[PDB]
Structure 1
Amino acid sequence: VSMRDMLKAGVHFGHQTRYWNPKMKPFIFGARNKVHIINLEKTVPMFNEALAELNKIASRKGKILFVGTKRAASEAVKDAALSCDQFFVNHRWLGGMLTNWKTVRQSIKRLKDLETQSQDGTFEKLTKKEALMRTRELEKLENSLGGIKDMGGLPDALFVIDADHEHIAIKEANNLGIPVFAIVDTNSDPDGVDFVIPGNDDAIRAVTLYLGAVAATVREGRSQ
């Protein structure tokens, strides 16, 4: 990544001054038009070091998970995870995914069974009434947990967009002792994150830049 490359993507833009958490005063360069500006000169090295640690942990062959739930970036996180060979969650995070995994395993199994029934030639003996509810259940289950259908255990690293919106996941990770790699805007609390990446978290361009950089770095980490 480069300062020139990411300055054109509008990363430095933050939120309104009325909303800034004081927990990240150092990360703010200044203000303009009553809107904060994020400092590039420090967000570059921390991002690079996070990427280094990330592909280092990837080379150990460790599964990782991408949390991004805004309706404007579900497609981007899905694309990164798919062309990453790694996993994702792109809808409402069901509380207790990590800390209550021994229960969500059952829903994973049910989704697998129902997918086999659907794409195995079974949804024709049903009397056009319960087949529809089976399809409805399929759609709900895949939209809620389709990106984690093959954990086979807890992950190792958990990557989050907009740490503030995803406090449940960060708390899950802190409870279970799993490192967190998150992007925080000028209104979040970075205490639960041990690898803080300052910057915007809602603009599509910045989100795409983050996801592309992470997907690349982890591909070269896996190829190692």
Structure 2
Amino acid sequence: ISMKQLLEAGVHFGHQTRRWNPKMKKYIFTERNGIYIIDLQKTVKLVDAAYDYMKNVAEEGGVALFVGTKKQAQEAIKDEAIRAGQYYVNHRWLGGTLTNWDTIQKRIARLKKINAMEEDGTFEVLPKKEVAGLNKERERLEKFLGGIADMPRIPDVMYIVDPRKERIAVQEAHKLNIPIVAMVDTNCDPDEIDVVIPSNDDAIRAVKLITAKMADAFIEGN
């Protein structure tokens, strides 16, 4: 990935100065118009390191979980994870998604069961009220667990856009010792992320560019 490609996508824009994390100075180039400008020279080095790291993860056949619920990130991380063949969370992270995995599976299992009825003919002999109700129930589960519905186990790596926003996802990863690859903004804490990518979290073309490379890495490694 090119330094101009990052610049065109606006990967350099940080947050307002007063809202920074002091630990991010290591990745900041300068400040402009009241905002911190990320150092793209290190961004290229770090995104390449993440690219190889994600690849080496896929080579093992391990699972990757793309987490991002930001408005800017929600559409991309869905597309790329499906594109890469991996699993994603893009609407809302459920507390216990991974730490409470056993209980969560009973809900993913429910989704499979209700999908079966539709492809089994039970909905044809249902008294309207049930089928309408179970359709709503299926819709909610797909709303939440659809992106991970087919995840075979707890992921070997988690990719997070705006880890500051995705606070619970970072906590569930630390608990389970799942390394995190994240786009880290000027306001985010880098010490919680094993593979840092200093990047803007608030520009769609910025999230699309970085997410695509990480998704491609999993395509290439597998």
Task: Give the corresponding residue for 1:132.
Answer: 132
Task: Give the corresponding residue for 1:22.
Answer: 22
Task: Give the corresponding residue for 2:113.
Answer: 113
The structure richer in helix per residue is 2
Q: Give the aligned residue type for 1:103.
A: T
Equivalence map 1:23-172=2 (5 Å):
23-172=23-172
User: Could you state the TM-score of these two structures normalised by the residue count of structure 2?
Assistant: 0.96
Task: Give the corresponding residue for 1:178.
Answer: 178
Alpha-carbon contact 1:17-1:36 (below 8 Å) kept: yes
Could you say what the CA RMSD is over the residues aligned between the two structures, in angstroms? 1.1
Deviations 1:12-63 (A, max 9, x none): 0111112111121111111111111111111111110111111011111111
Aligned-partner SS, 1:131: helix
Q: Give the aligned residue type for 1:165.
A: K
Alpha-carbon contact 1:171-1:192 (below 8 Å) kept: no
Alpha-carbon contact 1:68-1:74 (below 8 Å) kept: yes
Give distance in 1, aligned partners of 2:198 and 2:81. Answer: 22
Aligned residues: 222
Task: Give the corresponding residue for 2:205.
Answer: 205
C-alpha deviation, 1:176, in angstroms? 0.8
Aligned-partner SS, 2:192: coil
Q: Give the aligned residue type for 1:198.
A: P
Q: Give the aligned residue type for 1:58.
A: A
Give distance in 1, aligned partners of 2:112 and 2:210. Answer: 31
Structure 1 runs (4+) deviating above 4 angstroms are: none
Alpha-carbon contact 1:65-1:88 (below 8 Å) kept: yes
C-alpha deviation, 1:94, in angstroms? 0.2
Residue 214, structure 1, aligned to residue 192, structure 2: no
Task: Give the corresponding residue for 1:12.
Answer: 12
Alpha-carbon contact 1:14-1:200 (below 8 Å) kept: yes
Q: Give unmatched runs, 5+ long, in structure 2.
A: none
User: Could you state the TM-score of these two structures normalised by the residue count of structure 1?
Assistant: 0.95
% identity of equivalent residues: 52
Q: Give unmatched runs, 5+ long, in structure 1.
A: none
Give distance in 1, aligned partners of 2:118 and 2:210. Answer: 36
